[PDB]
């Protein structure tokens with residue numbers, strides 16, 4: 132498939148050699164640069180793949196990352212090395228983590244420009260990853276139930292993933308479907324919309340809005356629109372959250388990273404509350420207060436200058 | 445990519461050898477002594493351009509849904525000779541259709557209103573171009589529908605429900621026959637459109653046709669408004685020898701205001717799309733790749749009808765029984 136990019140032996144061996152440089156450098160992750168994880172041929176190719184998910188269908192699966200003979204610690208450093216050719220990593224939670232373990236789901240986006248998942252160990256049976264184009268869903272609705280689209284273009288309340296108190300979350304407004312200068316952007320997450328109601332000041336969800344978001348979920352789950360993906364050790368999935376909704380079917384171990392990327396799209400008016408800034412190619416996304424602190428923060432600035440990602444002041 | 449050509453991808457130029465091939469083909473046709481309705485590709489041989497023409501007509505089933513062939517040698521020909529040349533080219537395009545109540549299968553166009561023609565593929569051969577203006581305009585119907593899905597989705601339902609159209613095949617234009625058809629439809633993943641405001645408004649002259657509701661009038665007006673926007677329109681300035689080919693299921697066409705002379709033909713084609721339920725009234729048959737379109741009663745009669753059957757068998761166009 133066009134979204135599948137396989138690594139050949141030389142490229143896999145190139146990653147092993149890159150990790151050796153990183154391990155032998157005596158530098159910790161947050162002090163490293165791409166020169167400490169050299170990918171002479173795979174580097175430019177990875178940048179190109181990340182650039183390509185700015186277009187439909189908005190995701191890519193890289194296959195063949197050599198993780199089988201590595202320790203868990205070594206895989207994380209390898210993953211960190213690959214991330215230096217993807218984007219600027221972001222803190223993802225209130226625990227100052229920039230790499231989250233997924234071990235032992237309705238369609239949704241992650242609150243970041245690009246999310247990646249590296250599979251170290253695959254699920255025995257279930258755990259099939261599901262991805263769908265948000266624009267394809269919007270287009271089905273435009274044929275089948277256009278009367279509901281207006282509800283998804285008006286801003287709806289979302290609980291902020293960065294809320295310190297999840298029982299009384301901070302809330303921002305965002306449309307589910309938007310577009311700016313011809314580039315579409317989506318935000319969909321039923322749980323976050325329902326949780327927004329725990330803030331008594333947030334607007335109340337009308338039944339029309341509830342009907343519309345439920346319609347989005349129903350259509351996204353249809354066979355004709357879904358692309359299933361059964362992760363194998365060494366798979367690196369990359370998703371553009373402006374274009375893709377992702378989900379999962381019912382000793383797995385995946386590693387998640389969040390990235391700001393230099394090719395991200397500028398956003399429509401009013402999207403500052405949800406994303407921090409409208410301008411594309413900037414350091415943005417969930418939990419602004421988490422970012423740009425300590426050694427990790429100094430890595431973000433160096434990495435942003437390396438890839439050409441602007442840091443809003 | 446790595447190359448960026450001057451010509452648009454929908455522009456197909458003829459080289460000298462291809463032009464000479466048409467000149468030679470016309471010589472064969474004129475020297476055979478056969479009239480148009482008795483001829484076959486054997487009487488207008490295009491060894492290299494024939495297959496290329498078939499491929500271009502097949503390719504307009506996909507986006508962008510139109511093509512402009514440039515360089516047909518018409519400059520030194522009489523009006524009569526250009527018509528014979530055009531007829532020869534049509535034997536590699538599709539099965540020609542009767543277009544009006546005077547049994548014409550080649551109509552003269554002489555001296556906005558986006559619309560389709562009531563046929564699968566319409567072609568225009570430019571013998572003479574207008575000195576100033578007269579720019580041909582084409583727009584993607586699905587692109588118009590998609591703007592509406594963003595800007596005014598509440599109006600789309602009115603365009604998916606059948607609307608009344610005056611039938612071009614009506615004997616009495618002041619008392620037209622009327623059929624119902626949606627403005628936008630899709631079947632098995634392939635979209636189809638019908639749009640022509642004048643025809644929709646003229647349907648009201650038939651007292652039996654349904655009266656146009658406010659939502660329908662607002663919706664069709666919105667389609668016209670969006671189609672005329674600069675960002676969606678593709679202009680084309682015809683030159684002598686240009687052959688424009690348009691797939692009416694995907695493209696709406698129009699013209700800007702002003703010795704113009706174009707020749708129009710209508711074709712059933714073997715790669716045409718199957719249509720949604722209820723489209724029989726407007727098209728005759730839903731099945732794709734069949735002889736269909738406006739005025740079924742006009743077709744398959746006399747010598748022209750026998751040419752249609754021979755031509756349909758050559759190209760693989762089915763004739764429903």
Ligand SMILES: [Cl-]
Pocket residue numbers: 240241242292
């Ligand atoms: Cl999230």
Ligand SMILES: [Cl-]
Pocket residue numbers: 560561562612
């Ligand atoms: Cl017509």
Ligand SMILES: [Cl-]
Pocket residue numbers: 642643646
């Ligand atoms: Cl009319």
Ligand SMILES: [Fe+2]
Pocket residue numbers: 239240241377
């Ligand atoms: Fe997620």
Ligand SMILES: [Fe+2]
Pocket residue numbers: 559560561697
């Ligand atoms: Fe026309």
